[PDB]
Amino acid sequence: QSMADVEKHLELGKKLLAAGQLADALSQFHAAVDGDPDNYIAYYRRATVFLAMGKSKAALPDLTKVIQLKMDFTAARLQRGHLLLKQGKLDEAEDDFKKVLKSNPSENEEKEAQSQLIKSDEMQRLRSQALNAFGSGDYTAAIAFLDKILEVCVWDAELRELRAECFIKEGEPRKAISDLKAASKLKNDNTEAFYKISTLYYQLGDHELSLSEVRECLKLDQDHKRCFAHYKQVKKLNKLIESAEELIRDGRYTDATSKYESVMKTEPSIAEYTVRSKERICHCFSKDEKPVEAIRVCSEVLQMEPDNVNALKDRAEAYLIEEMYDEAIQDYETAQEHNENDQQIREGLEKAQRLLKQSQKRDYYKILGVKRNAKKQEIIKAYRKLALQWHPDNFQNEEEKKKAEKKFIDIAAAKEVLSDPEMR
């Protein structure tokens, strides 16, 4: 009987782990475990790969099987203790940590075991303090407690969740993502955990992520009436925004604008969706050279976010097409306060201020200038007419008159200022 298959599985398995493979190492140790359910080494190796990869649930059962099989082998009960601690299942961990110091206590192990029950004895104390502050209603308090507790028990989902809840109760919902993602990772098959986060990503408009998560919820359970419900939603909503963006890449702005209005229409509750939608619309008009509307919208946007860099920038490019430099600069200058080194913002000013000066100094060819660097005789030709034309004698009413004077003052101003050394 060549039980090589079960043997090779382990060799190949161990080499893979050693190479850093984990994923494949595991595919192998699974083989060995189903190969010889009775063997203890396998259960150990699988368990070590679970651990290596961030998988806490999956490892525990594999460790305790080892214990049961080779009841003697203590490093394993020590391994269990660690896990149960990373898990924050403190009582169970202590009860294991002690039976290590008690049954086959020895060498370096004694130190590890002992130093851990000290963390554990403070942890036990810390969760109480945390759960205290929370129950009584102090969130900021309980946050700081949990922060620490979570350095030692990195894989304690129930607490992470609680911490996440603190953040959101404190109105810092973006901070909760971190914990909620983890919590779902940890439990691996918890239907309500995936909702919890997907729901959150969604509130924050992280709509792409939200969708992948709720896919998960469903991959676990086809029939969840509530995951599905949410899924129809994000799908529809992502489909639209992902579509809109592609149209903004093709410069089909008007089409993108339409798209984004159906976006607001589909998700009208959450502010973040109308806002970001509007931003892009303000962007859509701007890049489409429709400045009036561009201005109209970016105004609404900066009203909700005066610090919205993109919005400022696009509305600036619009002011340009209208030649409103005092405004355009003011905007870039506001965006400056937000981005110190962004080339787009820096280059904004330099282009604008350049044009600002050339605008301030009035042009003479502006009055006619049939040719840039027109011949001195050709100039006089149209001047005679425009001197004939723009003389206040030509029309009766004063209001009009005063206005032509300005043209007259200038038409002649050209003459003296262009002939002789002047002009260049």
Residue numbers in the entry: 32 to 455
Copy text verbatim from the article accompanying this structure deposition.
P58IPK (58-kDa inhibitor of protein kinase) is a member of the endoplasmic reticulum- (ER-) localised DnaJ family of proteins (ERdj proteins) which interact with BiP, an important regulator of the functions of the endoplasmic reticulum (ER) (recently reviewed by Otero et al.). In this study we present the structure of human P58IPK, including the BiP-binding J domain. The crystal structure reveals P58IPK to be an elongated protein, with the J domain attached to the very end of the TPR domain via a flexible linker. From the structure we can identify the probable binding site for BiP based on the position of the conserved histidine-proline-aspartate (HPD) motif which is necessary for Hsp40-Hsp70 interactions.
Extensive screening for crystallisation conditions was performed using protein both with and without the N-terminal His-tag that was included in the expression construct, but crystals were obtained in only a single condition using protein containing the intact His-tag (crystal form 1). However, selenomethionine-substituted crystals, intended for phasing purposes, diffracted to a maximum of 3.2 Å and provided the dataset which was used to solve the structure in space group P312 using a combination of molecular replacement and single wavelength anomalous diffraction phasing. The two crystal forms are very closely related. Crystal form 1 (P312) has one chain in the asymmetric unit and crystal form 2 (H32) has three chains. If chain A of crystal form 2 is superimposed on the single chain in crystal form 1, chains B and C are shifted only 2–4 Å and 1–2 Å, respectively, from symmetry-generated chains in the other space-group. The crystals have estimated solvent content of approximately 72% in crystal form 1 and 71% in crystal form 2. The structure in the two crystal forms is very similar, with root mean square deviation (RMSD) of 0.8 Å (using chain A from crystal form 2). In both crystal forms, the electron density in the TPR domain is of particularly high quality for the moderate resolution, while the density for the J domain is weaker. PISA suggests the oligomeric state to be monomeric in crystal form 2, but identifies a potential trimer, generated by the crystallographic symmetry, in crystal form 1. However, no previous data support such a trimeric quarternary structure and in light of the gel-filtration data it does not seem likely to be physiologically relevant.
